[PDB]
């Protein structure tokens, strides 16, 4: 309906750029739009933007065209039998883990939060809490519809003619087009609940050996909160969370009778209910140490998607901070192999007098062939660092950490990395530029990050 100049910002609300901000539900204006901005030879380009997740400049495109997908969120069908959804690249997967559960499917593929676009699912090739089994979202598309430069709509499969236009997609952030409708294969299930076991760690050696001791193996869902801020032996201690989906029989007889209804999110959470904090006189002793202990370990514990996948949303308001601004968000892949290259980054990040409360930990399974998609096999960290002085420079001697030991940075986090340390990470990227250029020779898909990470 509406073109708008806008502020266009990341996640991590940093480094805005104003864009034209094409908001249609209509698909045949899309086309029209990138028809348009080809006939001029690509002006200064267009780019995709689904629910702005990203906490970078991937999904904005200063002085130039930025086209809102979100209202293009139809569910076209949904196979029980077949196990597919077709649905609009708009869609989110919020809305589609709804409309799914009654047919016994799950979405196959789960990030840290529910407000992603699919065409953003696919454009980051996103990853969760079950790769290491499931690897990530791409796996599992069956089919993308792309609108290319061409201003024709071409119908791409992960096998088949058009494979590596599929697979340079897949993580493409954008830049080979507009993702319209896509078909995905779910995971089926019977319940919408987990089957739990927990774990917690001593140190960061306890850590690494907890998922190197085959046990990994026994889950198709595994992550960990880790300490980033104590001192050795305390740093790269865990709270772990790992399971499986749950079958009905395993559920207790209360919830039996609907195995794969959702529970509303809660009014009250912890803030609400204990406004000053949760610390009293033996939080930071030995019986707080036992206590976190035997609260997070456990066994069998049945939870629902709010408990096992979100725990972060039971502490309400209190730390992100104030918001996603001003922090820094920093995620890392360090390949399996390189376990000592990997603690010594995570002693760096301690002895650099920036402190991060908020920690990811998981260990990633095999990658999958997109050239450009971010998850290998090996540690994978994410950090959350306040803005400060010295910051920017730390993180650009943590990229050089990063990249000496073969790992990379993730796009869907990045807003300050260099073109060159991001080449390095990413050696496949002269093989998927040579795509782009083949299907994007005007260069009418752009973005900020293209810009800046040289992938124009
Ligand atoms: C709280 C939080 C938790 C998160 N947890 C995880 C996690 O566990 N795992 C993980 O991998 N990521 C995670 N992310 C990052 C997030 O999953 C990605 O940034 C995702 O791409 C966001 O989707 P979006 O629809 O908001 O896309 P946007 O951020 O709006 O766009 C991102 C990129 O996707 C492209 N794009 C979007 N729609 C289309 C389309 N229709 N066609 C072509 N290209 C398109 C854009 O051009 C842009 O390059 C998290 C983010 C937040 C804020
Ligand atoms: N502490 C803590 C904590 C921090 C983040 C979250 C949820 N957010 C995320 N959770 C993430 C989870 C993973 C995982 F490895 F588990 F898949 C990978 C990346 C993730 N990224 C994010 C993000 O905010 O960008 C939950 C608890
Ligand atoms: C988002 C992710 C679950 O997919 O959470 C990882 C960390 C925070 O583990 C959860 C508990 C043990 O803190």
Redesign the pocket.
Same mark, same amino acid.
């Given at each position: 309906a509406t073109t708008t100049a806008t502020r266009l910002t990341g996640w991590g609300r940093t480094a805005p750029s104003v864009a034209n901000v094409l908001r249609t539900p209509d698909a045949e204006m899309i086309v029209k739009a990138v028809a348009r901005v080809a006939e001029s030879g690509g002006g200064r380009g267009a780019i995709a933007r689904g629910l702005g997740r990203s906490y970078g400049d991937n999904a904005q495109n200063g002085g130039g065209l930025v086209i809102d997908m979100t209202p293009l969120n139809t569910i076209h069908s949904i196979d029980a039998d077949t196990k597919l959804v077709d649905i609009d690249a708009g869609v989110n997967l919020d809305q589609l883990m709804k409309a799914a559960l009654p047919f016994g499917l799950w979405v196959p593929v789960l990030p +840290?939060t529910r407000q992603v676009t699919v065409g953003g699912a696919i454009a980051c090739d996103i990853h969760? =809490?079950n790769h290491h089994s499931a690897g990530s979202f791409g796996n599992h598309v069956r089919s993308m519809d792309l609108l290319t430069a061409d201003g024709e709509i071409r119908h791409l499969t992960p096998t088949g003619e058009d494979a590596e236009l599929f697979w340079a997609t897949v993580g493409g952030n954008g830049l080979t087009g507009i993702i319209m409708r896509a078909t995905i294969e779910m995971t089926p299930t019977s319940t919408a609940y987990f089957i739990a076991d +927990?774990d917690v760690t001593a140190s960061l050696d306890e850590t690494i050996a907890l998922h190197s001791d085959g046990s990994e193996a026994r889950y198709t !869902?595994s #992550? /960990?909160?880790f300490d980033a801020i104590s001192a050795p032996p305390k740093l790269g201690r865990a /709270? *772990? #969370?790992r399971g499986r989906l749950a079958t009905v029989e395993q559920l207790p007889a209360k919830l039996r009778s609907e195995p794969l209804k959702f529970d509303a999110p809660q009014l009250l959470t912890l803030p609400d209910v204990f406004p000053n904090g949760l610390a009293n006189k033996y939080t930071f002793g030995p019986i707080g140490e036992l206590w976190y202990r035997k609260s +997070?370990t456990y066994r069998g514990k049945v939870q629902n998607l709010t408990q096992? !996948?979100?725990?972060?949303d039971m502490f309400g308001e209190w730390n992100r901070a104030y918001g996603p601004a001003g922090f820094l968000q920093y995620q890392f892949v360090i390949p399996t192999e390189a376990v000592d290259e990997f603690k010594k980054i995570i002693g760096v990040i301690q002895a650099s007098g920036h402190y991060s409360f908020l920690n *990811?930990f =998981?260990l990633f399974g095999p990658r999958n062939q997109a050239p450009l998609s971010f998850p290998i096999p090996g540690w994978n960290i994410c950090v959350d660092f306040p803005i400060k002085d010295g910051l920017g420079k730390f993180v650009s001697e943590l990229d050089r950490r990063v990249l000496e030991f073969g790992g990379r940075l993730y796009t869907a986090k990045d807003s300050r990395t260099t073109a060159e340390t991001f080449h390095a990470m990413y050696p496949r990227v002269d093989e998927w530029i040579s795509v782009r250029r083949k299907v994007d020779p005007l260069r009418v898909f752009a973005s900020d990050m293209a810009r800046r990470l040289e992938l124009l």
């Amino acid at each position: 309906a509406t073109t708008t100049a806008t502020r266009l910002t990341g996640w991590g609300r940093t480094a805005p750029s104003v864009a034209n901000v094409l908001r249609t539900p209509d698909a045949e204006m899309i086309v029209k739009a990138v028809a348009r901005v080809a006939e001029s030879g690509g002006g200064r380009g267009a780019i995709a933007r689904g629910l702005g997740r990203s906490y970078g400049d991937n999904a904005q495109n200063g002085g130039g065209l930025v086209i809102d997908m979100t209202p293009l969120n139809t569910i076209h069908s949904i196979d029980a039998d077949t196990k597919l959804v077709d649905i609009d690249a708009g869609v989110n997967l919020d809305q589609l883990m709804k409309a799914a559960l009654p047919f016994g499917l799950w979405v196959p593929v789960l990030p +840290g939060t529910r407000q992603v676009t699919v065409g953003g699912a696919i454009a980051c090739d996103i990853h969760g =809490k079950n790769h290491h089994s499931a690897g990530s979202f791409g796996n599992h598309v069956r089919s993308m519809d792309l609108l290319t430069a061409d201003g024709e709509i071409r119908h791409l499969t992960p096998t088949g003619e058009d494979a590596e236009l599929f697979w340079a997609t897949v993580g493409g952030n954008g830049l080979t087009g507009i993702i319209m409708r896509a078909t995905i294969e779910m995971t089926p299930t019977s319940t919408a609940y987990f089957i739990a076991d +927990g774990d917690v760690t001593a140190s960061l050696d306890e850590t690494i050996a907890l998922h190197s001791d085959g046990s990994e193996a026994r889950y198709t !869902y595994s #992550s /960990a909160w880790f300490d980033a801020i104590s001192a050795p032996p305390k740093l790269g201690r865990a /709270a *772990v #969370s790992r399971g499986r989906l749950a079958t009905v029989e395993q559920l207790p007889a209360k919830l039996r009778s609907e195995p794969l209804k959702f529970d509303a999110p809660q009014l009250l959470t912890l803030p609400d209910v204990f406004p000053n904090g949760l610390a009293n006189k033996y939080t930071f002793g030995p019986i707080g140490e036992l206590w976190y202990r035997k609260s +997070g370990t456990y066994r069998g514990k049945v939870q629902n998607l709010t408990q096992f !996948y979100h725990p972060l949303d039971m502490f309400g308001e209190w730390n992100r901070a104030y918001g996603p601004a001003g922090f820094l968000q920093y995620q890392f892949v360090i390949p399996t192999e390189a376990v000592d290259e990997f603690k010594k980054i995570i002693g760096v990040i301690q002895a650099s007098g920036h402190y991060s409360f908020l920690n *990811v930990f =998981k260990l990633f399974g095999p990658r999958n062939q997109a050239p450009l998609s971010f998850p290998i096999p090996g540690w994978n960290i994410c950090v959350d660092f306040p803005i400060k002085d010295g910051l920017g420079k730390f993180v650009s001697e943590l990229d050089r950490r990063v990249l000496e030991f073969g790992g990379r940075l993730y796009t869907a986090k990045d807003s300050r990395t260099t073109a060159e340390t991001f080449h390095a990470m990413y050696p496949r990227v002269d093989e998927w530029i040579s795509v782009r250029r083949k299907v994007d020779p005007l260069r009418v898909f752009a973005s900020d990050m293209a810009r800046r990470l040289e992938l124009l």
